[PDB]
Design a protein around this nucleic acid. Sequence first.
RNA 1: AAGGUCAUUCGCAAGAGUGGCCUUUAU
RNA 2: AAGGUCAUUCGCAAGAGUGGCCUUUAU
Lengths: 218, 220
Amino acid sequence: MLEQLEKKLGYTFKDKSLLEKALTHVSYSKKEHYETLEFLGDALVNFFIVDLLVQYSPNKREGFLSPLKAYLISEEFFNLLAQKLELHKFIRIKRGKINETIIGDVFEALWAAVYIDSGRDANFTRELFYKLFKEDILSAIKEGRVKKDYKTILQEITQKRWKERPEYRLISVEGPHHKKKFIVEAKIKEYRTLGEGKSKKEAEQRAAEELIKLLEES
Amino acid sequence: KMLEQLEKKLGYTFKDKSLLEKALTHVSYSKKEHYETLEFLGDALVNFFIVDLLVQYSPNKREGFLSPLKAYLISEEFFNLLAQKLELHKFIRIKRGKINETIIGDVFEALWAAVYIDSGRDANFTRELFYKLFKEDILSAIKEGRVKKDYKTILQEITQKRWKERPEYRLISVEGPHHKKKFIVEAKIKEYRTLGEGKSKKEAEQRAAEELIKLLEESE
RNA sequence: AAGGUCAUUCGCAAGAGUGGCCUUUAU
RNA sequence: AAGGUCAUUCGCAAGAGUGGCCUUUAU
Ligand SMILES: Nc1ncnc2c1ncn2[C@@H]1O[C@H](COP(=O)(O)O)[C@@H](O)[C@H]1O
Ligand SMILES: Nc1ncnc2c1ncn2[C@@H]1O[C@H](COP(=O)(O)O)[C@@H](O)[C@H]1O
Ligand SMILES: [Mg+2]
Ligand SMILES: [Mg+2]
Ligand SMILES: [Mg+2]
Ligand SMILES: [Mg+2]
Ligand SMILES: [Mg+2]
Ligand SMILES: [Mg+2]
Ligand SMILES: [Mg+2]
Ligand SMILES: [Mg+2]
Ligand SMILES: [Mg+2]
């Protein structure tokens, strides 16, 4: 069933045991799993994306490119690129959902696989990667489909205005001990908002988005 | 130019000298044409070189084993060590300021991005050039335990397994001009205490943590 | 890495670098 | 990313994955 991936990919392995290893979670083999390929793949793809950014972005200033990169090398973004490859259909895994973290790990492991299989031909792998995703990446940027970091955007707003940082405090924690929903207040001066999520961080991001919003209505 | 000497050490001659010059130029010297963007590309480029090397020659290729190696091998400190081979500091163009380890580590990244660009974005070629200069020295530093230790992390792993607790760090003193400050910090776990000195809290906590680890290996 | 802040340098301002601190994001 | 820990799964132990929390490092 690797052949469907090999077509979506447009590459055929000279060693299918590499491709297999890259699609295989440890809960299906503690002998041959994506972990190591995931390590190389992260470095290899971060490089692809950054290289891409320096090529096409007119504003080449590190203060501009950086927060772009923080998004385009993120698990959240890798999962989107994986959707083009229907990556979840090829993942050797037993007990556990194929959640965003697994998908992203495989996506990293995959490109490591291609790289090594091509004989560590980074030039080839890079262009193959660009063949698949360059237009998708560049279009996300152009159309503003880049996830905003509201906590950082907020704090930079309030530090310029009041030389202070907002306060996030925990309001409630409810649900089964791994299906928890957090509710968090975010406050600056006397402006107060709420957020809810499945991590303390996620709820703080929501509240902070509301707070940015609230400060603009005023 | 003088660039011929660097080019010699490097084993590569630039087609575009301006490209080389930009990688060696701080913004204090030229707000128009300096190393910042190259530095950005280089960080990703060089990290990859390091990582691919680690995966290639290491028997233990576990995530949680390689990552701490990587964490030292892609650090400003370690890049300053590689820079020495090129004598990078005598080529850097900088105006009102010393050429500290941050500048050198920055230029080390930029220079590699510059070779990369100047080669027509040939990553295979650039990676082999890096290796020619640096592969043996890198592998040998790993082999010979010349890898800097993350004491604060080592220590909290020690105290957590033994006592299910993290050491406590408290500020004892600060000394000097707000831009040339010297910190003294205490690390504590149970009744064991050590002191540490540094030019930043983190560096002092690091020295404190190291001594505490030593203390714990005498009694525990 | 980014923002604020203390120091310092570019005569002050604006803007920038470097050093410290605090905080925040991504990997 | 690592360690501790809560939850959960692999029948328990051992080991490992996933989700939460806390802490630490590197870029
Ligand atoms: N918080 C962190 N501290 C140290 N290294 C990290 C951290 N996050 C990511 N890394 C490094 O980046 C590699 C790839 O990360 P990842 O894509 O999240 O699996 C890891 O194996 C580590 O070497
Ligand atoms: N703490 C950080 N938060 C976010 N991005 C970072 C951080 N440290 C390094 N980076 C990213 O890595 C790039 C290279 O870092 P550097 O080698 O320190 O100049 C930066 O330009 C950022 O894109
Ligand atoms: Mg990654
Ligand atoms: Mg992981
Ligand atoms: Mg990863
Ligand atoms: Mg928190
Ligand atoms: Mg770097
Ligand atoms: Mg850098
Ligand atoms: Mg910098
Ligand atoms: Mg900075
Ligand atoms: Mg982990």
